[PDB]
Amino acid sequence: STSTFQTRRRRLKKVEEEENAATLQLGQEFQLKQINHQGEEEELIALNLSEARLVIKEALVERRRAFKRSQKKETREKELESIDVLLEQTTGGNNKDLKNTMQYLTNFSRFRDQETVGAVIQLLKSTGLHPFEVAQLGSLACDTADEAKTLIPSLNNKISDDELERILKELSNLETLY
Amino acid sequence: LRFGEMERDCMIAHGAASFLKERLMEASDAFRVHICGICGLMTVIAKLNHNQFECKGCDNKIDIYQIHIPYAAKLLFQELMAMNITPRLYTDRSRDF
Amino acid sequence: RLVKALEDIMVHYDNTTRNSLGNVIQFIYGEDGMDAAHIEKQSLDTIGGSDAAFEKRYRVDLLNTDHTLDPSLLESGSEILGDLKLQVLLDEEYKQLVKDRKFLREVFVDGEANWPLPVNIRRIIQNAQQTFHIDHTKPSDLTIKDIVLGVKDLQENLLVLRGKNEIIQNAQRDAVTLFCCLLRSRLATRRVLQEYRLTKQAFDWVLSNIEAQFLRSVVHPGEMVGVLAAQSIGEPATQMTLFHFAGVASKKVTSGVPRLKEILNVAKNMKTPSLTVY
Amino acid sequence: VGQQYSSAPLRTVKEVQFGLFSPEEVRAISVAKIRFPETMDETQTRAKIGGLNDPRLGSIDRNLKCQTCQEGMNECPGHFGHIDLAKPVFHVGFIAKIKKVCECVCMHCGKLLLDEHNELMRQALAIKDSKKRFAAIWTLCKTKMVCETDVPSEDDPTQLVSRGGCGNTQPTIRKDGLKLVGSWKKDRATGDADEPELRVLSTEEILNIFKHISVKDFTSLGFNEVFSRPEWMILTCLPVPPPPVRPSISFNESQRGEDDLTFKLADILKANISLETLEHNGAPHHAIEEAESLLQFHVATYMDNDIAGQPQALQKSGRPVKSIRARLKGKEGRIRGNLMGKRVDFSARTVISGDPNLELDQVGVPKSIAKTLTYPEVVTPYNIDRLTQLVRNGPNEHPGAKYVIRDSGDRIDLRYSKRAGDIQLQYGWKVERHIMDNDPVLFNRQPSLHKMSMMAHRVKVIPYSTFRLNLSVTSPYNADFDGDEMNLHVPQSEETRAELSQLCAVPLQIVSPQSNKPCMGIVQDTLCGIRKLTLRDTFIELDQVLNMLYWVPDWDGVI
Amino acid sequence: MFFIKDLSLNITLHPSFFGPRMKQYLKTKLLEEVEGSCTGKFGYILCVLDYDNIDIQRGRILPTDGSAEFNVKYRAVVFKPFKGEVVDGTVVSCSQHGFEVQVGPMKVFVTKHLMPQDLTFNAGSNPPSYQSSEDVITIKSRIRVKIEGCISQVSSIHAIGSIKEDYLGAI
Amino acid sequence: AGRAALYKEVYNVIASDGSYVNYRHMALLVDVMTTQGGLTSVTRHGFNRSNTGALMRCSFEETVEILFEAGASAELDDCRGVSENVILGQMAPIGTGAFDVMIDEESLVKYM
Amino acid sequence: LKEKAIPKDQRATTPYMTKYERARILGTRALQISMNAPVFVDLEGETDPLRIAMKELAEKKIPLVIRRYLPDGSFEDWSVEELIVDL
RNA sequence: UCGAGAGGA
DNA sequence: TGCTTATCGGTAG
DNA sequence: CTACCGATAAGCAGACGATCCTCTCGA
């Protein structure tokens, strides 16, 4: 059993706090400002579909490098197969849930290359909004200012309707080609 | 053979913590029970096959811990529970001192 | 009742005698911080005797013909005579010896010398003469500077309490006192030669074997001390049994287990209230 | 473990929090409703009724049940049930506390007699204790029995300012058995002329006051905000203990054989069912109190039957009932009889005899005792073949084994087992093998006074049913071979085997720290002979001098 | 919806494995139990990040057994949903009641009621479909769904989503 | 000045009937009887009613009486004594159990 | 409260290994050798795990680290190699 | 199993 | 070995 | 001279009293 990180204190029963919703009312475990293994007070680490995609690959590519070290003593359709083989070399057949996620992340990635992602993250995580709001802006493709305000209700009063429209067009130009 | 009060005190004086525990637990009582992380009481409905480890009046199947305690100690906590006294067993330190 | 009262009492890793709650009972177990099984009844030669015999056996006077060391005891008997620098350390040696006499008499007021103390120094000197097969006719290899400083360095190596601050350091000095006084009493510059005739090879081994026997004699953190004390007081109570004390007239005085009941109960009872006046 | 694997993580209880049961949480905790006062037979047929005993809890005769959780008699600790009380009832142990609280906190308004404005109140609250802080509150609030609205005059110029509610006179309260009575004064040229007015104080009255008591007023009297609230000192709902607490037993087959508390709890139900109808139907006022007092008595005698000044209570035939207080009471009763002293497995005892051909650290174990005792030895490449000969020699030939525990929790009783002859013995298998020679094992003697009496002795299997031992090691045990009986406890781990040999060993305990001198020495025939020997008058010829040197085990061979 | 969560697990290791090839076995036993598993408290534990530089501290040995308790501290990726979260995935299962959508490792269902009225299920089509005018939902077809409700269930989080709202529907 | 006379009155009982007891044992019980402020009585009221946790004190005489008061005042047992761990059936912090032991990975490869 | 841990530098405890530390180290190491744990010292036909646990100490090839607790809660992580065995 | 008595080092 | 509760007589208001 | 502040007595129950071990005899 795990259940660690943000623990203590449970002072009898407790009314479960509140419901988990997209109105920034997140779980009693997921806070905007949380702790760290080092001990520092770090901001919530939320990633969108293109951000997280490159994050999981970075680890699994490095995993194959380390696992084979101890043994001694791009493109649309080609990315699908390369990831499929990579999951077989690092993880066992038991992890079915990971295979479904990788297939989904690569198919719906708004920004395939790491080069584009850097600027995207420097464009959104600068505005002064919640890290999860970013994880939905970079995930969901929005053309209208009102489209983004409806899908991500956490905004509405947080950002100006026109100022947000400026951002939407930049991500449209930043978009990857499939 | 009884390992009474006098028999305990001598093994204490020696400084032998494990033998005293071994005579009191494994060689005598010893019981493996499930305790709640929230209420801290043995209220746990622990099912070892269907894994339904729910606690009535907590609903959780997460914060649950197994413990190696004597049958006489468990019985004492149950006797005090019947006497409107709550000996809420807490695994975590909340005062340090 | 005794063992249930002193259950929690145990020596800690900071040489202190605390309990379950964490309150301090003794800052250093038994005032000295020693393991009770590593102690013998040893006599102190500083407190015992007249001031005339004490002057004869311990005073080293290089600046005299009759009160100096004969060259049949030391290798450098003639060149050590009448030295100013060497006698300074032998004035320091005797002034530390006269300090112990006035301090020991301040403590053991009755005049008792045979006190329970660790490290059998009386046996270490006995064993030294056997280990090296030393004769009395031939002189020692060492000098006065080797002896007086040898004991000085030895007193430093005896670490009961490990410290860095003024408090633990002053507590370390208090913890020894009685022992390093017996050590001054037994390893006096003249006593080493006049009585033992110890060589540099023998003396060096003796200092090293003294600190080793002393560090072995320190308590073991985890020792149930209070639990052990309870049995060490509880057990003799079963053997007594038997009141009259005269003497020294004391006929109607509560003695043994009936007297003990009152002490442990307290309970303001009359029983034997007879107060002593001087 | 109490058998089988568990998914949840195991951890040492670093602290235990005490408190009281909230009658609200007991209803949430409860697995069974509890209605029928009968226990045995479903509907006077067979297999325990859905009322008392297993309605949805603790299993009975060779049946698993246990509210769908099953597991059976072994592995189930029992599950608590609840019972709603018709009218509130005071708890036996808190009779004094409730009396003192009502004498402190003033009723009608539901607030303290003393307030922050009083200098003595500041002096009483100053100590941030719990019991000692409350001790000072008890003596001050004891007198001046009347509530106040305005009191400051020597902190404020002259005029008084508001602080409290209704200024009602607090009555003097005394304990008249199981109930409390408050005496209201007044009488100043009005009603009752001189003698004060007496009103009986029922649980319902007291509980209402205690509910109205402020959160800060609890902390002043030393109470908790969630663990111990004054409202929980008066029972409105009773938790019923499951069968592992109050067993069924049942001798023969078609019999009851129930525990004392199983009958006592049914008596409460019988005292409750009467009130249940009395409060519902034509209420005769002073006929309900005559039954309510019986329920107040039944609930109190269940917890404490020792008990008070005048009541006693018995379970006819003429013998009282065993209460919970009397069940876990001092000296041979749960705390002392079952948790500070326990009868333990892998032990032995027999009449003790002395021997000069034994070593100081050795003990002469009779051949049967070593044969009827086993130590668990795990199968490693360091033993295997050794254990293989113990397995084949079995439980009859002295150097043998009784039980072979596999990788999975399964015992192979060689006395029975059909495959006793074969057995391949896989690695990491526990072998309950007979106690061999030179085994470090705890040798006891009663009374065990000082650190000694319980030393570790180097085992030596020898014939004749009597515990042999060295003669010089008689002083640490203080016994003599005039029929003295000594205990023995066999360790069951490699840890405890070292914890004995490297701490409790006979030579380690040679020098008694009690008096900083040894507790052992040469005595009797050895003492008498050494005096006769060590003198100038006696000499030994060549024929006897060589045998004398040969008798020494550590002899150089040099004459 | 994806989060990088810092967390730790307690591992009890047998003494027969106390060798040089122990820390590599500690890490393997870790991702054997944690990676792939799902918690209601944290979400779907997808992948364990940084196999190198993993703090294990020191494993305290247990009282009457040679086993040691290691508190392995690690960093992993979690997929946790919310009751209001709008996510775009692919429809997999389809019938008369509604359709199931695969959003990452989690299956989300949409009822005939939670979807628009001006659609209706088409039985006479293989694979089963949902038509409207020119827009048809089949065995695949990518859609945008708003999570109306979130369900715990065993060690596999499931949800109940809707496509009947402005700027939702199909993509 | 009291602890010295208390020791003097305790020593006189041991000295009257032969067998010697090491100063430390007698100085100890006396030091426990004084380090409280005054004279701690070795009875059900004197020492038994102390700062110690509910279990350490319920082990001696006042059983159910102490448990009631433990639940009334909501007393917290810190589980750091002899009796409490003895009851709980846990390896108590006494001698051998007065320190936890871990295994070092740095040293594991160092010896191979 | 947070971390506490007195470093391997500046230590108030005794460098000598207490009989209690030795006995736990020996008991547990013998328990491990008894639970098929790997031996670091070059064994010489020793059938008893306690006999092995004793020769592991003579060569100081034990990977066990002792956590010696203080009454205030703080701890000093001392290794078997550091601790001098005199007794 | 409970309760009462007898006896032992 | 304690505790509990009236009665008492006394200084100052 | 009276109201109040604490003084000593009147009245007054509480719960504990070696550690282990052997055996019979009922209701």
Curated annotation (Swiss-Prot), chain A:
Gene Ontology MF terms: nucleotide binding; translation initiation factor binding
Chain coiled-coil ranges: none
Keyword Nucleotide-binding: no
Family matches, as Pfam families: RNA_pol_Rpb4 (PF03874)
Record carries keyword RNA-binding: no
Keywords assigned by UniProt, alphabetized: Acetylation, Cytoplasm, DNA-directed RNA polymerase, mRNA processing, Nucleus, Phosphoprotein, Transcription
Main location: nucleus
GO biological process, one term: mRNA processing
GO CC entries: cytoplasm; nucleus; P-body; RNA polymerase II, core complex; RPB4-RPB7 complex
Region described as Disordered: 1-20
Function (record text): DNA-dependent RNA polymerase catalyzes the transcription of DNA into RNA using the four ribonucleoside triphosphates as substrates. Component of RNA polymerase II which synthesizes mRNA precursors and many functional non-coding RNAs. Pol II is the central component of the basal RNA polymerase II transcription machinery. It is composed of mobile elements that move relative to each other. RPB4 is part of a subcomplex with RPB7 that binds to a pocket formed by RPB1, RPB2 and RPB6 at the base of the clamp element.
Protein name, per record: DNA-directed RNA polymerase II subunit RPB4
Species in which this protein is naturally found: Saccharomyces cerevisiae (strain ATCC 204508 / S288c)
Upper taxonomic lineage: Eukaryota, Fungi, Dikarya, Ascomycota, Saccharomycotina
Gene that produces this protein: RPB4
Curated annotation (Swiss-Prot), chain B:
Signal sequence segment: none
Organism, scientific name: Saccharomyces cerevisiae (strain ATCC 204508 / S288c)
Assembly behavior: Component of the RNA polymerase II (Pol II) complex consisting of 12 subunits.
Residue range from the parent sequence: 1128 to 1224 of 1224
UniProt binding sites for Zn(2+): C36, C39, C55, C58
Name by which UniProt lists this protein: DNA-directed RNA polymerase II subunit RPB2
Zinc finger (C4-type) stretch: 36-58
Extra remark: The binding of ribonucleoside triphosphate to the RNA polymerase II transcribing complex probably involves a two-step mechanism. The initial binding seems to occur at the entry (E) site and involves a magnesium ion coordinated by three conserved aspartate residues of the two largest RNA Pol II subunits. Present with 18700 molecules/cell in log phase SD medium.
Functional note: DNA-dependent RNA polymerase catalyzes the transcription of DNA into RNA using the four ribonucleoside triphosphates as substrates. Second largest component of RNA polymerases II which synthesizes mRNA precursors and many functional non-coding RNAs. Proposed to contribute to the polymerase catalytic activity and forms the polymerase active center together with the largest subunit. Pol II is the central component of the basal RNA polymerase II transcription machinery.
Family: Belongs to the RNA polymerase beta chain family.
TM stretches of this protein: none
Localization per record: Nucleus
From Swiss-Prot, chain C:
Subcellular compartments: Nucleus
Additional information: Mutagenesis experiments demonstrate that the minimum viable CTD contains eight consensus Y-S-P-T-S-P-[A-S-N-G] heptapeptide repeats. Identical and simultaneous substitutions in a number of consecutive repeats are lethal: 'Ser-2' -> 'Ala-2' (14 repeats), 'Ser-5' -> 'Ala-5' (15 repeats), '2-Ser-Pro-Thr-Ser-5'-> '2-Ala-Pro-Thr-Ala-5' (10 repeats), 'Ser-2'-> 'Glu-2' (15 repeats), 'Ser-5' -> 'Glu-5' (12 repeats), '2-Ser-Pro-3' -> '2-Pro-Ser-3' (15 repeats) and 'Tyr-1' -> 'Phe-1' (12 repeats).
Residues included from the entire protein: 840 to 1119 of 1733
Annotated transmembrane regions: none
Protein name per its UniProtKB record: DNA-directed RNA polymerase II subunit RPB1
Subunit annotation: Component of the RNA polymerase II (Pol II) complex consisting of 12 subunits. Interacts with DEF1; the interaction is direct and serves to bridge RPB1 to the Elongin complex in a DNA-damaged dependent manner. Interacts with the Elongin subunit ELA1. Interacts with the Elongin subunit ELC1. Interacts with ASK10. Interacts with ESS1. Interacts with RTT103. Interacts with SHE2.
Disulfide bonds: none
Swiss-Prot record, chain E:
Gene Ontology MF, one: translation initiation factor binding
A Pfam family: S1
Keyword Transcription included in the entry's annotation: yes
A GO-annotated cellular component: RNA polymerase II, core complex
Key words of the record: Cytoplasm, DNA-directed RNA polymerase, Nucleus, Transcription
SMART domains registered for this protein in UniProt: S1
Known function: DNA-dependent RNA polymerase catalyzes the transcription of DNA into RNA using the four ribonucleoside triphosphates as substrates. Component of RNA polymerase II which synthesizes mRNA precursors and many functional non-coding RNAs. Pol II is the central component of the basal RNA polymerase II transcription machinery. It is composed of mobile elements that move relative to each other. RPB7 is part of a subcomplex with RPB4 that binds to a pocket formed by RPB1, RPB2 and RPB6 at the base of the clamp element.
Extra information: Present with 6420 molecules/cell in log phase SD medium.
Subunit structure: Component of the RNA polymerase II (Pol II) complex consisting of 12 subunits. RPB4 and RPB7 form a subcomplex that protrudes from the 10-subunit Pol II core complex. The RPB4-RPB7 subcomplex probably associates with TFG1. Interacts with NRD1 and PAT1.
Protein name, per record: DNA-directed RNA polymerase II subunit RPB7
Gene: RPB7
